[PDB]
Amino acid sequence: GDTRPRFLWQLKFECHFFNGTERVRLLERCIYNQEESVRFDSDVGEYRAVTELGRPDAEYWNSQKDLLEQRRAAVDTYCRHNYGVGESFTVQRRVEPKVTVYPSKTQHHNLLVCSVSGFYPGSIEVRWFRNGQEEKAGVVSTGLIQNGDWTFQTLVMLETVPRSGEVYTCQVEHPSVTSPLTVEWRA
Amino acid sequence: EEHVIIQAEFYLNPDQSGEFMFDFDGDEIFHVDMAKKETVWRLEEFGRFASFEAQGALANIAVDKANLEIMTKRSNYTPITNVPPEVTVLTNSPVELREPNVLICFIDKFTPPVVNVTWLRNGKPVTTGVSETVFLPREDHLFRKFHYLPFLPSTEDVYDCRVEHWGLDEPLLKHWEFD
């Protein structure tokens, strides 16, 4: 039923940037059937085998003085270069989130949901206040969700039986607004 | 670290297909389409700030296929062992009646990168304006993929994401319906 065996080879060149381009590190990785076999780590400057399968390639590639010179240099020619190219629309991308509050039930209301949609980048702080007192216990969340199209979303819920006369406020802080967003949900 | 940029390629036999894409912090920047031999940007505004020479990517894949036959043999022809995906269906944003939305079917933590995905509206397969990402990388060397179905949310309709993969017994149906 298409039961034929599969053989899979994957390559990853990862550039890791710490504090801008101040410190950059390269990992070239060769992966056979989901096991990494050889790797080039800019911090070593030679290939090392990771499994027995990789030993031939590491020895062989380490003989090509040309290849090695090229990769050692790659942290300039490839990583820092590309960072430059894309910086303007990847690193500095900001997309403000949309915030909605709305009541709910649990698998008469018992749940206040605070939805935060369509923001970038991923890091956000969402908090619940009753009048002015932050509510910490009884908050549950979906955690940060990535949509795959350069936005994120999250739901942050608060288990409460809302008493009338109280104001619940969901407050969001995010690198795209220079002042926190709020949404009230009264009585 | 602040950020990571991954150039990620693969080649898979016997299906004889390989992708080449760039990832920034887990989002796709662009892939190269082996079929139409050109570069495809994940968002239009990217292709008007930067560009990429697609040709060289084919060069890499040809090499990758070469290497794949070398490894298949060197490993004494031992094949990949299937890892079945996990799937959740999600909307783009909280749904309001008669405003456009998108159903997201998120397929995660599986290998090899071959998965058949079909959308179902009230049980009939539907395909109008659907779209997909390429297979995206993970640090464990499994894959992720997103499938998209734009829709006008109504009380009437129920939707399903059906995912078939070599690692699963029967296929996975993941349900969603307006509340």
Partner: peptide, 15 residues
């Protein structure tokens, strides 16, 4: 417009 660079895969060892 900047042009993104890529790294070239190099061929392994055969017998």
């Amino acid at each position: 417009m900047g042009m993104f660079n890529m790294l070239s895969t190099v061929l392994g060892v055969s017998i």
